[PDB]
Amino acid sequence: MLTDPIADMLTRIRNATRVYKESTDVPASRFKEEILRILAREGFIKGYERVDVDGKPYLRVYLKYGPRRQGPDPRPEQVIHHIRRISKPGRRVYVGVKEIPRVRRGLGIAILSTSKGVLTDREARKLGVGGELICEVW
Amino acid sequence: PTINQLVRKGREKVRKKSKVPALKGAPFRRGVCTVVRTVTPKKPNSALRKVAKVRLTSGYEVTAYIPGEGHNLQEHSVVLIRGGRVKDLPGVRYHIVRGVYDAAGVKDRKKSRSKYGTKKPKEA
Amino acid sequence: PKKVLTGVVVSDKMQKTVTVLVERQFPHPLYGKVIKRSKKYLAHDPEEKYKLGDVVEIIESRPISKRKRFRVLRLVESGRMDLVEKYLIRRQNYESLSK
Amino acid sequence: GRYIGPVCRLCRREGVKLYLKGERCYSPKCAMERRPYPPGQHGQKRARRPSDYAVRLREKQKLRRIYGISERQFRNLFEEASKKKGVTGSVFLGLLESRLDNVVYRLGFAVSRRQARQLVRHGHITVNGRRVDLPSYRVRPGDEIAVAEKSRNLELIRQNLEAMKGRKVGPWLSLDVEGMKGKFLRLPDREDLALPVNEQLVIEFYSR
Amino acid sequence: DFEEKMILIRRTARMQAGGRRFRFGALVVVGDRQGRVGLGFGKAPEVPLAVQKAGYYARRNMVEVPLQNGTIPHEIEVEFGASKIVLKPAAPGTGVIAGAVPRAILELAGVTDILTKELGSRNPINIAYATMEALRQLRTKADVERLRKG
RNA sequence: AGCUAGUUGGUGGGGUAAUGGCCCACCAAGGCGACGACGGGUAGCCGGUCUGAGAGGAUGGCCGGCCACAGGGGCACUGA
RNA sequence: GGAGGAAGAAGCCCUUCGGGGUGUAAACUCCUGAACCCGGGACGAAACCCCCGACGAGGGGACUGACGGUACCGGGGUAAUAGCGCCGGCCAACUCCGUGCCAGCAGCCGCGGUAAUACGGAGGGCGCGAGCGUUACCCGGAUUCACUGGGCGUAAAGGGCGUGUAGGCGGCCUGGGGCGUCCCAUGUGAAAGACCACGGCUCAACCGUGGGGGAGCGUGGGAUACGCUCAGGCUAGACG
RNA sequence: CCUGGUCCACCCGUGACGCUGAGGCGCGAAAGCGUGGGGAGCAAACCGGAUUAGAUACCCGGGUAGUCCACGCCCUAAACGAUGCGCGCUAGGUCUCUGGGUCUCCUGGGGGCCGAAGCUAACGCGUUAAGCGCGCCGCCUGGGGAGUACGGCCGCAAGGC
RNA sequence: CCGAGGGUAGGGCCCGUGACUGGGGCGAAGUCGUAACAAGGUAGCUGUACCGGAAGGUGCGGCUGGA
Ligand SMILES: [Mg+2]
Ligand SMILES: [Mg+2]
Ligand SMILES: [Mg+2]
Ligand SMILES: [Mg+2]
Ligand SMILES: [Mg+2]
Ligand SMILES: [Mg+2]
Ligand SMILES: [Mg+2]
Ligand SMILES: [Mg+2]
Ligand SMILES: [Mg+2]
Ligand SMILES: [Mg+2]
Ligand SMILES: [Mg+2]
Ligand SMILES: [Mg+2]
Ligand SMILES: [Mg+2]
Ligand SMILES: [Mg+2]
Ligand SMILES: [Mg+2]
Ligand SMILES: [Mg+2]
Ligand SMILES: [Mg+2]
Ligand SMILES: [Mg+2]
Ligand SMILES: [Mg+2]
Ligand SMILES: [Mg+2]
Ligand SMILES: [Mg+2]
Ligand SMILES: [Mg+2]
Ligand SMILES: [Mg+2]
Ligand SMILES: [Mg+2]
Ligand SMILES: [Mg+2]
Ligand SMILES: [Mg+2]
Ligand SMILES: [Mg+2]
Ligand SMILES: [Mg+2]
Ligand SMILES: [Mg+2]
Ligand SMILES: [Mg+2]
Ligand SMILES: [Mg+2]
Ligand SMILES: [Mg+2]
Ligand SMILES: [Mg+2]
Ligand SMILES: [Mg+2]
Ligand SMILES: [Mg+2]
Ligand SMILES: [Mg+2]
Ligand SMILES: [Mg+2]
Ligand SMILES: [Mg+2]
Ligand SMILES: [Mg+2]
Ligand SMILES: [Zn+2]
């Protein structure tokens, strides 16, 4: 019945990329779009549009991957090598502003819901706020 | 374990057993000799280790190893006990601090002598 | 300020007093997860106007008796036995954990 | 304290050469020029590869036997540096060098450090007026390391004050040989220092 | 032709009617100290030989260790086998703190400021293979947003 | 693993510098507990101190703040 | 104690009987002078108190030092204590002789059975130095109680299987409150310690000043994504 | 005859009413126990016969409880997939059981083998996961001592937790 | 009246200790056998029951970690 649709979403993606794939379709959500908006806007995907599979709203999310490689196992590098959720439904993980993590030395992103919209490690540090550290992506 | 589970059960501290009860966790302990025998070694070794059962001040009683070569310890002598087992003589778990009270330092030894308690000699 | 609390009257069986069960929550000091945890306070009611099932604000008051350092501030919403049941069931569950 | 014993013997062992002595180490007889092999009954034998540990030991030992300082103080300093901000590699030396009994060695006043020591401790040296018998006394930036009135007149301060006329000295130092009174310009920069020692390896030996 | 310094060597053995034949193993690291290194494992009927092969293989398999001040771009963790390895960059002037294997490797890779830590199985061989695949996975802000084009 | 007779509450009194079952008469039958009541064991508590990459772990001698006791126990007098 | 000093004394230890070692170490030669010897010798102490003014604000005058003739200053001045730990591996430091599963070593793996770098003595070497070793306890290594940060097919670890109480956990949309949560302001968070600077005693240890931080918790204000709560709706879970 | 679960089809109804689950409660192979029936075959025990240095055994001839039924206990196990349950997600191939369709084909549940990716110490796992994730319960923390002791609770006992 | 405590009586927990008894650990080279590991020379293990100097045997059902 899904408990955290988000960790799901993210997993949907983690699994998607593993074999590389046009897109994958998380079921729609005004928060999942939100989260997704920051993947594309930060360049982890091509993007997403609404769709449907018989009355049921989803999100076609078009992935992104690296350039074909040489040598054995010529599968591309991954645009998203790692995406694991922080705050979980069984342990909400909140953070003040000075506590906010520094993913991978700026190379990654700490998406995180806040009192003024879904920001990120840099975005929130600027606006000077905090909130439920949603997850770390790189 | 889940997080909720830790909120219930929670992790359990180890707490370790005192390899030696020299009592009061004191540095050393004094005691009088009850018997002064000579026991034999364990698995692959062979010898005649010089040992003593000591009657501590703590109404206890324990066997104890006697360092060095040759000693001077009798059924009524007064020893100070140190503590370190002997990976060879099941039973012995304390050492005799040489050259203190009725315990005489090692005779004619010259090498490492903090251990073995013999005084530094003169060359002449 | 005179510390105020909010909770459910779970017992009306005293003369001029009610037991107000009081829930509260916080982040676990090592394991994060927020955790509910409650306490019962005995509250003065010099008019016995408060009945079994009310939610109420209580206020740190000067000692009325032993065990009793709170007056019932004001009502917050009558008729809420659902929470009282939550309490009573718990209480009743006990019988089955002895010998 | 300050070692005190056979020394053209660690001039040895450390392989690399040092001048605990001063003059004689220049001779064609530092014993180093004569026996390239570390001391003891063995010495000249097929020397087995040093276990990583050994390496880091010999290094730090080298660097220490140079200023012939106490393991404690060396360490003290090390930690002191480690605490203070900056690349501990250099800064450890900076202070290792600021040691009076060393700042007085680099300003010609003496030939060996073991001589430069007995110099400071015997009050023969002095600073901005007041004399100092404190080998450990760390010199800051902008200080006058003169000699003393009762000391200007020594056959030994002189003979070392002698060949020193003209000879050049570290960039962080300035000597008015006439008035036999040297200054300390600044805290040295790594290069300014030339020693046979990879500071890195020391810093590592203490991460044991 | 590079630095070439060998990690560990071991004698192994196999049984056969009449006693125990042997063999020797050599793990070797290779580097110029600019950001080039390679790991090489070589077994053979004798010490000298084995070590040789070690070097040969070492060169065959080398990785572009992309420094950024004599240190490292980002912090990484990698499990190969039962062996986990942590790599954290230090500010200039620190030292390369690690155990034989990880250190060894990292010196010739030309690092100078790195925090490490072996976890799990501290089997040299597998810590080796471990570290490589860590370095082999190093990215700079460049090659990063180089993939976030679109 | 069940606890409880001043026990929980109430009216009226006594007591104090003052609240209060602190104490006393009477009335109601209550109070507490797996969020660990009751019981057993061990311990003065903190600012700190030690160690550790840190989160933690251990610790509370010197110095500073509070508590407690003055051979064991009980009581009150004087008095701000 | 410092500077010089042999292709290098003796003694002593190895020796493939040529030699190698301690070792510039010593002797030996010069120069400095810990101690001790003589003289000088405080800061800590300006108030209280007396006079004028008013017994006040302001001005002046005098008494008082336990440590103590000690610190510190000036002169003279003698070469003037070294010790303990270890050297099989971890872990740095190697060879003779004795010994012969004996005597003994030992934190672990182990050593000693007639050639022992592992016992005991020696020569040498490493290490630290007014110390060095040992025993006892705390933390660390121990990612071996794991929040950071582990696990359960066969290594230790899935309850023999259900039903269900409390509890934990909660799908899509809309709004109200703002309890969690986030921000700002302010009170509090003594001093001492710590930590960054600066000086005070010859440095240092100790010590002063100044600054900077401290989670928490109270108070006021604000935000409303996520969690919570109240309310209205949906059909993808669930049920019929 | 009485009754449970379970899958399919139609998209009709309610509109999150869900998942898990400390304790509790129920069920729980064989053997074993109580009361009362039942007894052919088999068969602990036990008796014989061989074998054997011996043979309290293996092989042979007998044979009692038991094995069966009714009611009540006991509550253990290699109670084994040695794999807790629920949900989402990540190639296919092959045969097999059983539904449904404008049926050489598609689709839905179930049971097997080979296997992408990925996991794994390895063996192996692999849409019936040991993959990748969330929820909740149980459990492990070196071997022997020892599932022993003591206490407690349950049991008629054996013994169980 | 209350009251330190003292007295009588009866319970609860904990430590020590005791003729004797039970098993358990360790012990360079003891006695009796051979149970297990290879079809272990009767596949093994297993819960239970009965039995036997001892490992063990057998009965019933189970597991393959056997064939
Ligand atoms: Mg032996
Ligand atoms: Mg692993
Ligand atoms: Mg009372
Ligand atoms: Mg006490
Ligand atoms: Mg740590
Ligand atoms: Mg008293
Ligand atoms: Mg060595
Ligand atoms: Mg020894
Ligand atoms: Mg020896
Ligand atoms: Mg370490
Ligand atoms: Mg720990
Ligand atoms: Mg965890
Ligand atoms: Mg583990
Ligand atoms: Mg197991
Ligand atoms: Mg199961
Ligand atoms: Mg089991
Ligand atoms: Mg429920
Ligand atoms: Mg403070
Ligand atoms: Mg409707
Ligand atoms: Mg259920
Ligand atoms: Mg049966
Ligand atoms: Mg029967
Ligand atoms: Mg038969
Ligand atoms: Mg028959
Ligand atoms: Mg049964
Ligand atoms: Mg089966
Ligand atoms: Mg199927
Ligand atoms: Mg398969
Ligand atoms: Mg399939
Ligand atoms: Mg044990
Ligand atoms: Mg057991
Ligand atoms: Mg049992
Ligand atoms: Mg019992
Ligand atoms: Mg009494
Ligand atoms: Mg058998
Ligand atoms: Mg057999
Ligand atoms: Mg058999
Ligand atoms: Mg059986
Ligand atoms: Mg039989
Ligand atoms: Zn020299």
GROMACS .gro file of C-alpha atoms (C1' of nucleotides) in nm, chain F:
model
   80
  720A      C1'    1   0.422  -0.703   3.864
  721G      C1'    2   0.128  -0.569   4.087
  722C      C1'    3   0.126  -0.102   4.492
  723U      C1'    4  -0.165   0.177   4.858
  724A      C1'    5  -0.497   0.322   5.554
  725G      C1'    6  -0.326   0.947   5.583
  726U      C1'    7  -0.372   0.566   5.152
  727U      C1'    8  -0.650   0.987   4.697
  728G      C1'    9  -0.993   1.364   4.737
  729G      C1'   10  -1.347   1.676   5.018
  730U      C1'   11  -1.577   2.021   5.437
  731G      C1'   12  -1.399   2.235   5.925
  732G      C1'   13  -1.022   2.286   6.223
  733G      C1'   14  -0.482   2.286   6.443
  734G      C1'   15   0.042   2.446   6.282
  735U      C1'   16   0.394   2.779   5.996
  736A      C1'   17   0.684   3.327   5.779
  737A      C1'   18   0.345   3.093   5.404
  738U      C1'   19   0.111   2.646   5.035
  739G      C1'   20  -0.024   2.144   5.139
  740G      C1'   21  -0.302   1.480   5.421
  741C      C1'   22   0.230   1.868   5.731
  742C      C1'   23  -0.104   1.732   6.130
  743C      C1'   24  -0.642   1.626   6.355
  744A      C1'   25  -1.197   1.500   6.354
  745C      C1'   26  -1.574   1.367   6.007
  746C      C1'   27  -1.763   1.241   5.488
  747A      C1'   28  -1.678   1.021   4.967
  748A      C1'   29  -1.389   0.569   4.746
  749G      C1'   30  -1.047   0.687   4.572
  750G      C1'   31  -0.472   0.740   4.410
  751C      C1'   32  -0.049   0.448   4.132
  752G      C1'   33   0.134   0.122   3.780
  753A      C1'   34   0.474  -0.231   3.136
  754C      C1'   35   0.563   0.538   2.938
  755G      C1'   36   0.793  -0.005   3.460
  756A      C1'   37   0.428   0.155   3.994
  757C      C1'   38   0.630  -0.179   4.435
  758G      C1'   39   1.071  -0.398   4.565
  759G      C1'   40   1.601  -0.503   4.551
  760G      C1'   41   2.097  -0.339   4.430
  761U      C1'   42   2.461   0.072   4.360
  762A      C1'   43   2.541   0.622   4.411
  763G      C1'   44   2.598   1.258   4.692
  764C      C1'   45   2.443   1.596   4.208
  765C      C1'   46   2.633   1.978   3.867
  766G      C1'   47   3.001   2.357   3.646
  767G      C1'   48   3.362   2.001   3.475
  768U      C1'   49   3.743   1.612   3.417
  769C      C1'   50   3.949   1.181   3.103
  770U      C1'   51   3.922   0.947   2.647
  771G      C1'   52   3.720   0.963   2.126
  772A      C1'   53   3.746   1.178   1.426
  773G      C1'   54   3.308   1.267   1.610
  774A      C1'   55   2.803   1.059   1.817
  775G      C1'   56   2.930   0.846   2.225
  776G      C1'   57   3.176   0.596   2.658
  777A      C1'   58   3.388   0.659   3.160
  778U      C1'   59   3.412   0.977   3.551
  779G      C1'   60   3.268   1.377   3.961
  780G      C1'   61   3.962   1.389   4.364
  781C      C1'   62   4.168   1.934   4.365
  782C      C1'   63   3.862   2.462   4.263
  783G      C1'   64   3.358   2.684   4.224
  784G      C1'   65   2.758   2.619   4.305
  785C      C1'   66   2.372   2.320   4.578
  786C      C1'   67   2.241   1.916   4.898
  787A      C1'   68   2.348   1.599   5.337
  788C      C1'   69   2.580   1.470   5.796
  789A      C1'   70   2.882   1.610   6.283
  790G      C1'   71   3.006   0.876   6.759
  791G      C1'   72   2.447   0.599   6.656
  792G      C1'   73   1.923   0.800   6.706
  793G      C1'   74   1.527   1.133   6.904
  794C      C1'   75   1.372   1.630   7.063
  795A      C1'   76   1.306   2.088   7.103
  796C      C1'   77   1.486   2.587   7.324
  797U      C1'   78   1.692   3.081   7.187
  798G      C1'   79   1.664   3.359   6.740
  799A      C1'   80   1.618   3.777   6.157
   0.00000   0.00000   0.00000
